[PDB]
Amino acid sequence: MLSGLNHLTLAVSQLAPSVAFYQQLLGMTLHARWDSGAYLSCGDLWLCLSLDPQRRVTPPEESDYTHYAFSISEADFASFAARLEAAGVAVWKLNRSEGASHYFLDPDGHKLELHVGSLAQRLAACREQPYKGMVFF
Amino acid sequence: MLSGLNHLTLAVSQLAPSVAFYQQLLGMTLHARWDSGAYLSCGDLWLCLSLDPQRRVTPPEESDYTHYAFSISEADFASFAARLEAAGVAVWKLNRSEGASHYFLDPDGHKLELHVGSLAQRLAACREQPYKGMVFF
Numbered sequence: 001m002l003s004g005l006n007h008l009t010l011a012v013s014q015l016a017p018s019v020a021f022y023q024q025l026l027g028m029t030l031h032a033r034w035d036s037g038a039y040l041s042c043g044d045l046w047l048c049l050s051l052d053p054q055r056r057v058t059p060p061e062e063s064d065y066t067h068y069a070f071s072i073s074e075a076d077f078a079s080f081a082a083r084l085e086a087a088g089v090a091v092w093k094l095n096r097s098e099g100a101s102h103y104f105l106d107p108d109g110h111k112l113e114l115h116v117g118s119l120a121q122r123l124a125a126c127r128e129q130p131y132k133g134m135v136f137f
Numbered sequence: 138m139l140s141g142l143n144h145l146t147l148a149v150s151q152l153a154p155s156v157a158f159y160q161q162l163l164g165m166t167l168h169a170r171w172d173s174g175a176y177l178s179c180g181d182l183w184l185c186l187s188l189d190p191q192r193r194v195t196p197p198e199e200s201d202y203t204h205y206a207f208s209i210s211e212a213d214f215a216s217f218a219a220r221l222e223a224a225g226v227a228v229w230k231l232n233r234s235e236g237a238s239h240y241f242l243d244p245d246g247h248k249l250e251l252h253v254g255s256l257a258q259r260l261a262a263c264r265e266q267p268y269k270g271m272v273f274f
């Protein structure tokens with residue numbers, strides 16, 4: 001039986017700028033780094049950055065909608081989003097189609113998101129403003 | 138301040154086979170489905186499947202090392218791997234690291250993993266046998 005996400009591994013093209021992005025800019029905890037990777041945590045999330053010569057810096061119009069959202073409180077959301085904007089972090093989406101979210105890119109174009117709210121809260125919001133064809137189980 | 142992973146969204150080329158894979162084969166709970174996506178949970182993980190015509194069915198040689206690992210107990214690992222094998226699910230890598238791992242592909246070629254073990258366990262093993270260039274913080 002599967003019980004959750006054990007870890008997220010992101011391939012990165014340049015290890016040091018990626019470590020800086022996740023640790024310095026996003027505030028995640030850096031536990032270890034080596035010549036070809038790093039281990040970080042974000043709350044209970046284990047994040048692995050893996051130096052991969054195959055990773056390409058990918059513009060958002062070239063990649064699909066696969067993305068990774070990080071939880072933030074309602075009190076912290078706007079100032080964190082505004083700080084990323086002021087720091088020049090690139091974006092990839094503007095329309096809030098799934099609640100209070102800020103969509104931004106990592107240095108390699110991994111699609112990231114700040115989001116306020118749980119799945120339960122999402123489902124409750126969708127009952128009032130459902131997607132097309134939506135069924136709840 | 139970021140407090141964890143809020144959700145993982147996978148772009149999928151065909152919604153029905155992806156729902157079958159995550160719900161029926163992998164045993165995740167399906168909470169809602171709409172014409173262009175679905176919401177599932179796996180323990181604390183909120184998974185979103187998003188129907189995306191830009192998703193290519195991608196051979197593993199043509200994608201980078203970015204991947205998503207799910208937690209499973211040691212006791213359940215071998216029978217779950219055998220279930221995936223019986224279903225004909227392709228493997229993209231053999232395990233050569235600490236902790237049991239099974240590296241398998243989803244219908245669109247998303248790189249998945251079953252892993253037994255925490256970040257703390259990995260760090261303890263690395264302290265005893267550090268990777269080349271490893272520094273701890």
Ligand SMILES: c1ccc2c(c1)CCNC2
Nearest residue numbers: 009037038048049050234
């Ligand atoms: C460094 C960074 C990430 C990973 C590994 C090593 C081995 C297991 N799969 C994930």
Ligand SMILES: [Mn+2]
Nearest residue numbers: 069098113146
């Ligand atoms: Mn999202």
Ligand SMILES: [Mn+2]
Nearest residue numbers: 009204206250
């Ligand atoms: Mn892994």
